[PDB]
Amino acid sequence: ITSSPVVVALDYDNRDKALAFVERIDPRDCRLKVGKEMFTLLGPQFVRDLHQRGFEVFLDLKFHDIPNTTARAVAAAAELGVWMVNVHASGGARMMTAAREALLPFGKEAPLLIAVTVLTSMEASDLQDLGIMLSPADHAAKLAALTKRCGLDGVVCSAQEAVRFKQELGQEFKLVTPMTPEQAQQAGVDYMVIGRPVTQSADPVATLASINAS
């Protein structure tokens, strides 16, 4: 297992460079996130290699499709054994319900099922283009609320909103964040994705130690 809430983003262009960083660290100190870049390049096999090496994996593919296809993609993630997988709440309640129901047969050995609400990249201008008058946080709030209605395990959101979300949605609703690793823990966050501060550091392990220690 691992006591850490830290998930280290592996956003590498190349297999060996990723694994050479992964050798330098220990499954006890963090989990790993595998996103669309490395998955499109290497496939589930890279996730298996991380599993061999003892790590738990957040498969961050942000599934956004019709309900049958998302349910089958999420079930494939569960068959792969990953620890967390995410879907777009923008896919709607039926799609999330279907992703949830696909995991029921896996029991307590299913990955956590997290919704992306509003991508951290989106400003209000981006939202106007798509016909969303609200602010990024009000729309994210509405999507988070829809996510909890469908019984998913939690949402991706800013640490700024952790306070507000743990309020409206409950303590057990997991908040994943893609404001210090101390300030965020106190404000509600459950797991913390951190990339370059760890992967571009000199002693990622010590950096890991330092974040963890707080």
Active-site residues: which are they?
62
- Taking CB under 8 A as the criterion, the residue among 17, 20, 28, 43 binding its own copies is 43
Nearer to its own copies, 147 or 207 (CB): 147
β-strands 112-116, 154-156: how paired?
Answer: parallel
Contacting residues for 196 by C-beta, under 8 A, at least 6 apart: none
Contacting residues for 69 by C-beta, under 8 A, at least 6 apart: none
x/- track of binding to its own copies for residues 53-82 (CB under 8 A): --------xxxxxxx-xx-xx--xx-xx--
Which tokens hold the place of 204? Answer: 């990622």
By CB under 5 A, tell whether 120 contacts Na ion: yes
Contact 152, 113 (CB under 8 A): yes
Give the three-state DSSP class for 176.
strand
- Taking CB under 5 A as the criterion, the residue among 35, 67, 111, 178 binding Na ion is 178
Nearer to its own copies, 31 or 62 (CB): 62
The CB-side HSE value for 198 (13 A sphere, CA atoms) comes to: 27
CA distance 61 to 73: 10
Q: By CB under 8 A, what part of segment 111-130 binds its own copies?
A: 119-122, 126-127, 129-130
Site residues, its own copies (CB under 8 A):
11, 13, 35-37, 39-45, 61-67, 69-70, 72-73, 76-77, 79-80, 88, 90-95, 119-122, 126-127, 129-134, 139, 142-143, 146
Site residues, Na ion (CB under 5 A):
119-120, 178
